[PDB]
Structures are given as structure tokens and as C-alpha cells.
Symmetry: C3
Subunit: 625 residues, 3 copies
């Protein structure tokens, strides 16, 4: 019966379309849409599981580099998981499965489909892997052995069989993630497998497979620190690669809508950003609205006391370096550099596998310095640290993992500012030298803006407030960041006063002793005939008081729903004591007082408070290391 | 007959493919390609209509937040459009339909498919919405009620039915735009609907649906200013969300090729950029080539006199803030901050719904200041303003909407420079304090560049021109920006002169009185034994004269087709009077004259004209507020 | 027989699906997946061929602008390649086919499918183009004649037939690349074809076609320099467009995973980046790991002596300008600006077709200056040049093309830093004026970082090293960049010394004569009562010595696999002679010595070495022009 024939396997081949081709050929050529749709559906599901403390069953492919090949170092463990070669003490799938749940709360289950020396053709034809593993996401890395001619693999065969593997795992219900092959000389020798896998990356993008640039992971690392032989990593290299893959997942890198961090990006807890993926690893971050938050979003990132809380911010850094700024408060253990989440210590050179500037002349060896106490100058913007290297970065903000935190830690905002790598510092004065920029905090009294057609009356410059430049802020854990007991913690600045008459005064604004936040100005350069005509400059470090712009209950009850606050109610001097000072959320101001000897001259004053700040720093950050 | 059976509904199920599955199952799994292709075809059509003064029929989905739910504030209007709950006086679909035609000229027709408390399953099964509305684009927002368990909605049911809605509206010929759900505490409480709709965003990207991050819209706003209750917006919040959606459309955000503004992006009228989408709302922008344009592209953005002209620049800002620089001239009414296109004034706290820095200590309450008169220092780069917050931004450059503009306004270029939020200012001296950077305008006479092997002869430093740093430029509407009548409008700078002999002179370059653009230098620090040996420093603010690089008609007639101009013909002093001065298109130069007392010493001079400029400012911008 | 009928052309139409539509209609609507998959598969293949010295058969479409229409200038050649109109002496397909193999080694074969005045409908119905050309990639540009109503072309007909052309060329095995139409007034007149082709771009993105923004190419150029008539280019405009298309290809712009350069991006040879595509044009770049590399990646980009080596870095610049920094060494001929790879010189105004800032007041006419000798201050970061304009940029690092290079040239890293256009310089002091930023190199002895709770002992400030700011570095070819023989090559800086006691000293740090790299400080401003109490400041320019962090062979042999090096072994003075000095890879340090007259006061010293640097410069770059 033709019916049975139509219902048979070859039924689609007996029906031809208007172009002369059979229906079966049309279906076979156009099935990439089904694979693409299934792939991104499963990828969206996997992203949801990553960001919602879910569970991921992960199948890990392909060859020796996925298998954790290590036959050179003494940090090896016997061959497991269907491999034949001695494995490093920690490969990338296992570091991924130990890292992703730790940072995001998403449980990871490993299905190791990795054999050393295997090709894409070998993986597609491997007897043990012919069954559906029923996992959620599959990471595929096959280029190194393919380009070496292993098992007669050619570029066409490699590409065909990697496409076949992608389609097979998509049909198996697995989200296919394609990895640019990792390992070996940071691109030394112009390896063919990079080109092969680039072609395969584009063919994978045909199916909507996200590409994890694993070659990018080791670009800014020390080769000796991450490699066991000329091609394969040691334990630390594999661990860093797995951590970077997990960072890609918690960044939202599985999604097509993901955008890398290219400019200054400020995110907080509970808000969804396509640039920085935030993961609450244990679900105990209190993302409630409180007026006590130091940001206008009022979204307190409460890392509550007594609860082991882990706050994770993952993103792709599209620059050679970035500066992490945060409105943090409390004892927050911060890890953001690879090689400090995991280091077994088996090899002494693992610690030198951190992301470092490749330019020998632009940076010394990177001694990573992270802050754990961000409780000083409470309410102020804190310098969390720096991220070196282009790629996927994770900022781990966690409290005591045993739940022994006595006070609430707050992550009110995390700012990732891509910075040029030579203009970045590990901490404030935490490296040999900081290439800073002379930043001018300028104020005009009276300002010419908005006047128009009319000359404002000249004013006497007797007192003014200026936001303290970054050099004026100290670095230290907790209250040690305040220069109150150690007035050397702040860099003396310059206050340059200009007027329309050509009268110029330059003061050296340095802190006056170790009792309170008081600054005293020394006259450096002035245009006056006598130095006795120069006013005495005294300043104090203070924060702006809180005024209520719109009080809740003004147009109904209910009906500016919340309180719109500003810190423009006046400047109050701070003594550096958090128990008696106001919150520094209103800003760190240097409130200058000019004690003129005679009557205060009236004029159109331009005040420039000079300091050195990091490149592009929006707000002066207090250092906490 | 098997034929009738094949032609029947179940005909595809009776034919099986080579894998054992029926042809019908193959078609059902692989139909995502058709939906994706139709979706982006309609999205491209919708983008064309947005950017070509077209017409869009917009169907608005889904729940209470799309419906404009407001049952708390007194700014409510009775339930319309098939909803049951009291609506805010302006929801986001209606603000979108009032904003998109106003800014782009694209007529918007509303089909309100929004009911308060509705889920994706309820929308797919809603009796009134089972018919094809025959609209062009559909915006879908369903996560809040789904995650609350409304009508038994689960995550799987939610995802299934949102995918069903997307496919249904794609088949109906509607461009499907997916919105990250908006509303409530800026991410407070770690809402489940954010995660659900993130998963749904990825599944929508399966179908090529652009994702409008509506959660991102309220991240940098005051919660009390935009919310009516804990989850739903008031009139201003909905208005800002609709304006942001329209900004996404006029940015080109409907297209996969759209790229966010990540670095300094300069665009003008009539040119197509994948970063900044420009919309001519009324078709009356004269985008002709004239040598009178202040830019080398010669594309004059003539907002012609007597014509109501609206120039719109929309884009996604991938930074926490940006600075708008423009080569504008004339009376251009500028609106670029949300909350100033629309504000009914019913609630006094609506004005505090502007994009503000969440850091209390990095910014006071944002008092938005926009310039309407950019006619001063004509030809110079103008500081248009700042954009705060990551997301979609619109820059509206419109003249008198009644056609009563007497002179032609010119938009020769608009530069959007992503800047760190703390380094941004609303206007020049328009906020409490500007965190500026000390910018050094350095010139070497003779320069060592390009010499090689040979020592150039030492030259006498008697006169030189330097581009005026930003601090040297004033702010004011029209001619009020020129410090000619009010010499306090400019900040005095420093001219530091170095030579190879170790001779150093530091002048205070301040403006000499209120008659003309003349600057006079006061000697601050010098290395000479006697201050009488220091030359007298006099400067004037002037522009470079026009020289013809290649005159049209030189190699044929026809045949450098146009005139290649440069402004390097010499420096001419300007008096600040636009009726007698040259155009400032040649740059704002401080032309210094050194009157040495004895013969002018010869040497290898390094001249550093110090000033304070905004972070990353390419060209010194004149302020116009 | 129904069987024959099913196997007939209309067989699919006789089988209907469950929705009532026939199987044929389902196949016709959902075939976009097959076209998309084939398109990106061929695009990945084409990208592989571009980056692996492959071969591309390129079919060039569409109208007069693809055909190289030029009927106005005297730089025309008779009509070739099936066109009817006089062609410019170099159109964009031929410049592309001469440029892509030159820069990437990928052989290009031209199939000219371009006729002047042709539309998309005309191209689809052209008799000569009905056959499959069996080429690899097709570039399509059809909007100008379509919007003019040529051959009755309407927007719907245009869109339909361009989609038909895209599908036809995808079925023909050709990678379809869609070009935003180029030509005419930089967007003058608000041309309709820009909008039409924007719609067509989105419909092309339906099929995964990469969009080459050719309208973006001429945005920052002089119109007179690139145009022959009001719409069509001259030879130079077409050449620049073809070079930009080739730059798009070597950037990896054919791939969906490509990301533009938005922030500082550092890449080297042999590494794969999704931001900067690196092409080894002749396969002779030695990308081996050597400790002699100036970067921590140790990937030497050896342009070996005696071999014609071409190193190409292509990328999309998502800013108005960028600065090219490189750790280069040797005689590397650098071309990075369009109009300098190709210029036939037939028209004198072709040289003014370079990417220039459109703001007349922010830049003079761009006199491009590129460095060929980067052998000075060996090991230091070099300022390669600047890239102006948003779009696709190529950095060509090639040695003597005849193989007469005597020494090995090294490309250890190329850094592309997007910079604001007004803050960019062509070379160090290579333009009229550099708008620099006052950068403060700050060091604290003792630093307050990491101490906590305890006051460190005060130290005497007798000697310290500081990384030299950019103003301290000279510019010149090879050893001419060293200020050793011509001490005017460096800009004198300021060393500001602060302490906790309010003692401030400001020195003028200028070079002490022309014998060696010795700097001497002149006291400018001090807070001391007597200038005799100020210490004598002497400095030398030196590099840090090499210390071994982890020596290879420490934990096994094999087993920190390589040597982890740092340059923190001490500071050694350099004389500027490359034959006797150390490599400058350890950094360019100004090592200051303070000779106090009495005993050296002890205190908490803040040292600020002030200089002027370019905006966002990570490491001080030596200029090489």
C-alpha cells in the first residue's frame, strides 16, 4: 500500500516539492531551526537554574583538555571518568561543579564525556556516549586533536562531526555550549585548532550555541603557572578555566541578550541586568527597600547577620582591566580574582596564575589584595578592587560561611568600571605605583550657569564645601580607612582659588593632626603682594545632612509612595567615629573655611580642589584593604 | 482514499521520516524558524516605520503593569480598555503612543490587551483576544502574576504559554517584543518573576524577539517617585516606562544589528548608525551638505526657521552615565531626561523620578538643567547635558513647535560619551560640585616628533596658540556663555612653560577684564632668580582661520568634488560678538604672547596649559545653560 | 497513481497539516531556518579562510556603487565587468580583492555582478546572473536605485526582491553579506535608501546575514575627497569602502560572536579574540613562547628577519576614536589609517579622505603620521598611533616586503584603547595641540593600605622610584625617542611631596643635560621657611631589574612549567643606549634621590609625580614617530 509506504521510513522521500527536491531533503536542510529553538530554550532554562539556585546536569566534552590531562606535574591524580591519562588534581569540569553551586547555589552534576586524545569524530562514534545522558547542558571542546590529524581527522571531518555532536546533544535535550579550545602557549605557534574551532564556533552560532572563549582565559596569565606541558594545563589552569566557565554561566552568558560590561556598570542585588549577572547563592540576601541604603534605589543588599550569605556578580569584562567600586558596608569577604577561590597549594607557582598585565613594563608581579572589612567611612563608596584581563569575571561578596557574622553586611551597589590596565590599581596604594590622573573638583561662586544677560552680585569666598578627591581618602580595613588616628592615610591635595580679578591662591590641603577629620591649608602659591593678605584655610571632612525632597504622605497618604531623599541639608563635620558620625551616604565633603585677615574681598570665585584620582572614577572611593 | 487522507488534517501524521518520527512532528519541532523569520521581518518593518515617520499599530500585553494598574494614588482614572482596576492617569502604552509619534513622527495606534491580575495562560485563553488584532507590533509583559501562582500558574505553564503567545502573535503578523517585567522595589525581595521572565527572555530570543529591559528603567530612579504601591507604578513610572520603550524603538533596538553606546559615539542628522538611532519627527530637517557646517562631514542638521522641527537621537547607554556633546547652533529646545517630556504635575514627587545616581554620597538630588540656547560661541562644541542611568535614552532637539523660530538651528553632530556617573555634571557648574580631571594641553616647540637623528634648532618662545581647556570656557544661554561681559564665567587656568635647561614658569591665566576675550597671566611659580626675568604673559581667546586644503576644481572641475577645508590658516582674536566674530568651528584657542624683558631666550620649550575638564572630553565644550 | 502525484511537484500541496494549511505552505514559511543555517555555516567557513590564508571566491552585488560608478572625475577607467558606465580607476570590489589577500593572505577572486542603475528586482531577474557563480561569499548592496523608483521599484518590491536575492545566493552556497548602502553626502537629504536598506538589514538578519555599515565608512571623511558626484565615490572613496569591508572580514565581523572594541582591548599574535581579529598574512609570524617577550603572556610576535612578514589586527571600533598602543620592537612599517594602504595619487585631494574629526573646532586637518621604527626604549610600550572614526579598522604591522629586514621585529601586544576623538593625538606632539590630562603618579611611604589598627613607623624620604608619566617620555624613530642626546624630547614634570605634618615640596623635574637619562629637580613651591631646607632632587630614568618569582624546576622539573618573572628586583639606571641598557620591559621608572641638607626628616610621605598623559592611558607609551 502506498499508505504503508508513506507511513514508512522512506515516505518523506517519495513526496517531492515544487523545486524538484523531495520533502525529506527539504526537512533535512531546514532542521537547523528546530535545533536552534531547542538549544536556546534549554539555554534559557539553564540560565534560570543558574540564577535561581536550581540544579544543572552538565555533560562535559571533549578531549584531553576537558578530561584534565596532566602527565607531567606531580599534582596529578589517577585517571577517572572513562579517561586513560593521569588527570590533574582538579580539572575544569570538577572545578566548575564545585564553583558554580558555591557562587550561585545552582547544584551541578557532572557527566564526564572526556577522553584524552579524542576527536569530534571519535566522540560522535564513541560507544559509551551513544546513549542520551539526560543532562541539562553540555559543554563541548574539540579542536586540538582534530587539527593534529588524530584518527585521520581533517578540517571538513572535524567540522561535520562537531556539527553532528551539537545536533545530537540538542536532540538529547541538552543545552550545547561551545568552547573556544583552551591550552598551550597563549596562542603560540599560531595553532591550527584555534582557526578550526573558530569556524566551528560560527557553525555553532548557526544553532544558537553560546561560545565560551576559553582561549581568552589564559591570555593574561603566566604560562608557567597554568601549564603542565606545552598544551595541557595543570590543576590551577583547569581550575581557572572551570571558574571562568561558571562565571560565564552566572553572568547570563548563555543568553543571546547578554551584553558585556563595556563602560561603567552599576548594579545592585535583586535587579536584573543584561550586563552583570547577579546570583544569590543561598537565597538569604535581603533585597528589601530601606531608606538606610546608601543608594537612591534603596535596594539594601543585606547580607544578614548569623546567615552564611554569598553575593555573586558575574559578567564579561570587555576591557583589559576594570575597577570594582561598591557601596558596601560591613564584614564582606571579597574574592574576585581567579586563583583565590581555589588553590590547592600543591605547586608554589599556582599563586602566579592570576590575571596580570602582560606588559612587563606596565605592571610588576600582581600581588592580589582583597578587602574583607568595608565598614569604614560607612555609607561611602568603597574601592573593592580591580579585575585584570578580558573575559568573564565573578565578584564574590560573602560573609562568614559558618553563620558567625555578628552584624549585617550591605551590598547596596557594585560598580564595575572598565579601566585601562596600566591605570588600574590592586588597592589604594596597594601596588608599587599608581598611575593616577589629576582630577579637579571645581566650584564657581557665583556660578555663571543659568544666569543669562545679567551679572550676578559678587560674593565673598569665606566658606565652601567640596567633594573630597580620591587622593584625600584613606585606605584601611574598617575604621583604619579613616585617617582620624593616622593622618598619613590621606594624600595632601591642592586648593586653587581663582577670581575674575586675576587673584590666585594655591593652598596645600593636608590633614591637621590625628584628632578628628580636620584639614589645614598651607599657602603654596598666591598672586597677592603679601602672604599676610592670604586667608587662613581650614577644612574638615564631613558629610551632607539629609533633607526630605518629598515626604511620603504629601499628596494622599500612599502618594509619593516613598520618601524622596537628598543629602543637601547642610554639611556636618565627622570625627571618623562610626558610632557618633552620620552615615557617609551624603558624600565625603571637604568643607573649607577661609578666614580672611581683613574684610573678605567680594568677587567671582572659581575654586579648584585638586587631587589624584583613578581614571574615570565617578565618586571618590574609600579603600578597605 | 489515502489521497483524501493525505489531504486531510492528519495527513502529515501518516508520513514518517527516516528517524521514525512522523512528518508532522518534524514540522512541529522545526517551526521556530518560520516564527523567527516572520518576527524579524516584521521587526525590520516596524523599525523602518519608526525611522521614516510611518505608522505602527501596537498591541499592548500583558498584565496589570501593562494595564496601568493604580489603585493607591489620587492620580488615577477609571478603568478603561477592558481592564477592571482603576488606571493611572497615564499608563505606559498611552505614554508610548503619545511619545513615539512626538519624537519620531511614527503614528502609534493602541490595541490594549491588558487586564490587571492576568497571567500568560489567561491571556492565551482570553476570549476577547482570540481574534487577530491585525496590528503591527506587540509588546508582551507577563511575569508578575505568573510567579504569584495566579490561576494556578507555574513556571512550566508560564513559560509554555508565553511561548504560545509569542508564536500566536508572530503568526498573526505582529512583531513580538518581550519586556523584562517592570515594577516593584528596584529588585527588592529578589522577585521570582524576574527569573521567570529571564528564562522567558531566552526562549523569546529563540524567536528573535527583542527584549526590552523594563526592570532596568526604574533601577536609577526614586522608588517613591515612580511607584503607586509596592509593585505597580504611578502615572510617572508608567510614563517613564513607555518613554523608554519608545526610546528603544527609535534607537533601532528592534534590530539584531543594534549595538549599544559603549564608548564616545558621534552621530549627526541623516546618517545611519547602529549605535544611535536618529529620527526626523516631521521630515523638515535639512540634511544637506554645506561648508557652513562646523563638522568635516558638512552634513548640516538645519532645523529651519519657521518650521516646527524635532530632531531625535535614541540609543542604549551601556554606562551608568553619559555626557551629551553637540556641535549645535541656534535656539534648540533640548529634552533628554525622562520626566521632562511628560509630567502632569498631579503629584509633587513626580519631578524626582529622574534618572539619578543611586549613591547618596556621589550625587545630591538631581536638579535637571537643560539648555535651549546654543547660539553662543557659535561653531564651538556645546555641552548639551548628561544622561544618567543604563538603558535607552532619547535626545530630543526640537525648535518652536508652533513654527515661530526666527533663525535656523543647526544640529551638526551629537556626541554621546559614556562617562562615570560621579564624573558627570548636569551642566557646566550646574550641580553642587564637579569632579573634574586636570587636563594638560601640551605643546612642544620644537617638537621632537619626526626629527630623528638630528637636533632641531632651539626656538624662542614668544608666542603660541593652545586649545582652551574646558575650565577656560564659560556656561550660559547664547552669548551669555561668552565671558566677554562677565569675565567670571571662565575658570582661571595655569600655563606651565618648561624648557630643556630646567627653566620653569607657571602663570595663572585669568581673563583680563570684561572687554573682549583677553586673558592675562600672573606669575605663580618660576625657576628664575628674579621675577623680572619672567616674560609678561598675555593671551586672547580666538579661533583658527580657514585655509583651503584642496579647492574644488583643481583636478578637473568636478574633481576634488567638494572643498576640503582645514582651520589652520592662522589665529584671529575674537571679541565674543557673534555678529563680528568668525565662526568658532576652527576651535577655541588661547593664543598666548610672551613679552620677554630682555631678548627672548632660545630653547626647547614644553608648554602645558593646565585646566580642569570632564572625564574623557574630546573637545572643550561651551555650556549653554 | 496518487503515489506518482505525491512524488510529483505538487505532492506537498496535496498533504495538509493540522492547522488546515498544506505541508507545502508550512515548508515555504519555515525555510528561513535552512537559509540561516547555510548562511552562517558558509560565513564561518569564509571567516576561517580569511584568518587562515585561505581562498575566497567573492561575488559582488549590487548597483552602480558596487560597480564603481564614476562618470565625473578624470580618474576613471572604461566600463568593465558587465557594467555600462565608466568606472573609477579602483572600485571597492577590486580594492577589497587587492587588500584582503595583502593583509590576511586570503586570496580573493572577484565575480562582478554589478551594473550601474540596477535594482534588486533587476538583479534577481538579470539573465547573466541566473546561473550559480559557485563563489564562496556574496556582498550585496542595493538601495539607491530602488528608492529612486528605477524600473518601478517600490519599498515592498525592493524588500521582497532583496530577500529573494539573499535566499537565492544562500541556496547557491554563497555567504550573504548585506551592506548598508554607501555614497552621497554623509546622510545629506535624509536619503530614503538608508531607511529602505535598514528594513532590509533586519530582514537579512532574519537569515543571519552580517550587515556591513558602509554608510558609516564615509561619515568621518571629507565628502569632496571621497565623492565623484553627489552619490557615487571616486577611486579613493571606493577604495576606502573596499578596505573597510576587508577590515570587517579580518575582524571576524562575519561571525555572530564578534564583539566590537568598546573599551581598552589588548591582543597579541596567535591568540583568538572576539574583539580584534588577527591575521598572519604570510604565515611567517613566529608566535612562540619566549621569556624575551615584553609581556607576561610571553607570546613573542616575531616578525622574523629576512622574511616578508605582515601582521594584521582588524576590529570594529565602537568609539569616535582610539589610541593604538603596542609592545613593539624593531623596524615595523605601520599602516592603520585608510587612504594610506592605497592612494593612486591621480587626484590631489585623495590624501584628505582620511578619517578626521568632523568637528572643525576640535581638530585641524589630519596630517597622518605613522611610525616605522619602534626600536627605541626597547621593551617599553609604544604609541603606535590613533584611529579616528567609528567602524572597522585594520592595523597593519609589516616588515620589509622584499625580505630585507636585518633584525627581528616583535609584536608582543597591540592595545586598542577607544579614546574621545578630541583627546586623541596622531603621534606624541604630532599634531597642533594635545588635549592631555594631568595624571598623578602617587606613592605612599609608608602606605596605609593593609596595616589596620596599627600606626607604621615613620620613614625618611631619601629615595624612591616612580613610573614615568607619559609627558616624561620622548617621541622619535628608534633611539631618537630616547631624550639622551636631545633632552628637549621630554616634557618637564612636577614632583609633589606631601607628608602628614603639612610639609609640601614641589619640584620641577626636568632632564639634566644631554648625557644619559638623568633628571634634576628645581624647587618650585615648598612649605618650608627656608629654601635651603628643601632636599636636592636628582632622578634617573631606569627600568626595574628582573627577579624570578617561581623558577622552572622547583616542584619537579616540569613543574612550574615555565618561569614566572617579575620586574621588581631593583631599579637600574639606563643610559639610553640599547646596546648596553637592559630591556625596558620592566617599566620606565624615574628613580628619585632626595639629598636632604640636614638629617632626613621622618614622616608619612605622599609622593605625587605629576605629568600629562593621554585620556585613559594604562601605561606610559614611548612615541616612535
Amino acid at each position: 500500500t502506498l499508505r504503508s509506504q508513506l507511513a514508512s521510513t522512506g515516505g518523506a522521500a517519495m513526496v517531492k516539492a515544487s523545486d524538484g527536491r523531495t520533502v525529506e531533503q527539504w526537512l533535512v536542510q531546514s532542521d537547523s531551526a528546530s535545533f536552534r529553538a531547542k538549544n536556546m530554550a534549554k539555554l534559557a532554562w539553564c540560565d534560570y537554574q543558574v540564577h535561581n539556585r536550581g540544579s544543572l546536569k552538565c555533560c562535559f566534552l571533549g578531549d584531553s583538555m576537558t578530561a584534565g590531562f596532566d602527565r607531567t606535574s606531580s599534582d596529578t591524580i589517577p585517571a577517572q571518568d572513562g579517561d586513560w591519562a593521569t588527570r590533574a588534581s582538579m580539572n575544569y569540569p570538577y572545578r566548575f561543579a564545585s564553583y558554580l553551586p558555591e557562587q550561585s547555589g545552582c547544584s551541578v552534576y557532572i557527566t564526564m564525556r572526556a577522553i584524552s586524545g579524542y576527536t569530534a569524530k571519535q566522540a560522535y562514534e564513541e560507544a559509551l556516549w551513544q546513549s542520551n545522558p539526560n543532562c541539562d547542558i553540555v559543554f563541548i571542546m574539540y579542536a586540538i586533536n582534530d587539527s593534529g590529524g588524530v584518527a585521520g581527522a581533517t578540517l571538513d571531518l572535524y567540522m561535520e562531526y562537531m556539527e553532528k555532536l551539537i545536533r545530537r546533544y540538542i536532540d538529547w535535550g541538552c543545552a550545547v555550549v561551545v568552547q573556544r579550545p583552551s591550552g598551550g602557549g597563549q596562542g603560540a605557534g599560531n595553532p591550527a585548532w584555534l582557526h578550526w574551532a573558530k569556524r566551528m564556533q560560527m557553525v555553532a552560532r548557526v544553532y544558537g550555541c553560546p561560545v565560551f572563549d576559553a582561549h581568552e582565559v589564559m591570555l593574561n596569565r603566566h604560562y608557567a603557572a597554568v601549564q603542565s606541558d606545552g598544551t595541557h594545563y595543570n590543576s590551577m589552569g583547569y581550575a581557572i578555566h572551570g571558574e571562568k566557565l561558571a562565571s560565564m554561566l552566572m553572568a547570563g552568558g548563555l543568553l543571546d541578550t547578554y551584553k558585556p560590561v563595556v563602560n561603567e556598570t552599576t548594579v545592585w542585588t535583586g535587579m536584573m541586568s543584561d550586563h552583570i549577572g547577579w546570583c544569590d547563592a543561598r537565597g538569604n540576601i535581603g533585597t528589601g527597600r530601606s531608606d538606610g541604603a546608601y543608594t537612591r534605589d534603596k535596594v539594601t543588599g543585606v547580607l544578614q547577620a548569623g546567615k552564611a550569605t554569598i553575593c555573586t556578580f558575574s559578567f564579561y569584562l570587555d576591557a583589559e582591566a576594570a575597577h570594582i567600586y561598591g557601596k558596601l558596608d560591613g564584614l564582606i569577604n571579597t574574592i574576585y580574582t581567579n586563583g583565590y577561590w581555589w588553590n590547592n597549594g600543591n605547586k608554589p607557582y599556582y599563586q602566579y596564575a592570576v590575571d596580570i598585565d602582560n606588559s612587563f613594563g606596565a605592571s610588576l608581579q600582581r600581588v592580589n589584595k582583597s578587602a574583607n572589612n568595608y565598614e569604614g567611612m560607612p555609607g561611602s563608596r568603597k574601592f573593592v578592587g580591580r579585575l585584570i584581563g578580558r573575559g568573564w569575571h565573578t565578584i564574590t561578596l560573602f560573609t562568614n560561611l559558618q553563620g558567625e557574622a555578628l552584624k549585617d553586611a550591605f551590598v547596596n551597589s557594585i560598580t564595575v568600571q572598565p579601566i585601562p590596565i596600566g591605570l588600574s590599581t590592586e588597592q589604594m596604594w596597594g601596588q608599587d605605583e599608581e598611575r593616577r590622573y589629576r582630577v579637579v573638583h571645581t566650584r564657581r561662586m557665583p556660578s555663571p550657569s543659568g544666569q543669562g544677560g545679567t551679572l550676578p552680585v559678587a560674593v565673598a569666598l569665606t566658606g565652601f564645601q567640596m567633594r573630597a578627591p580620591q587622593s584625600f581618602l584613606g585606605t584601611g580595613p574598617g575604621t583604619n580607612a579613616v585617617p582620624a588616628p593616622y593622618f598619613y592615610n590621606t594624600v595632601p591635595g591642592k586648593l586653587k582659588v581663582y577670581n575674575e580679578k586675576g587673584d590666585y591662591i594655591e593652598w596645600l590641603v593636608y590633614k591637621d593632626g590625628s584628632s578628628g577629620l580636620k584639614w589645614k591649608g598651607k599657602v603654596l602659591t598666591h598672586s597677592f603682594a603679601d602672604v599676610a593678605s592670604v586667608p587662613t584655610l581650614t577644612a574638615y571632612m564631613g558629610t551632607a545632612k539629609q533633607n526630605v525632597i518629598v515626604a511620603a504622605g504629601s499628596s494622599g497618604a500612599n502618594q509619593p509612595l516613598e520618601n524622596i531623599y537628598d543629602y543637601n541639608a547642610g554639611l556636618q563635620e565627622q570625627t571618623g567615629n562610626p558610632s557618633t558620625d552620620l552615615s557617609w551616604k551624603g558624600g565625603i565633603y571637604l568643607v573649607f573655611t577661609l578666614a580672611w585677615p581683613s574684610t573678605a574681598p567680594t568677587g567671582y570665585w572659581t575654586i579648584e580642589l585638586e587631587g589624584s584620582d583613578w581614571f574615570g572614577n565617578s565618586e571618590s572611593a574609600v579603600g578597605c584593604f
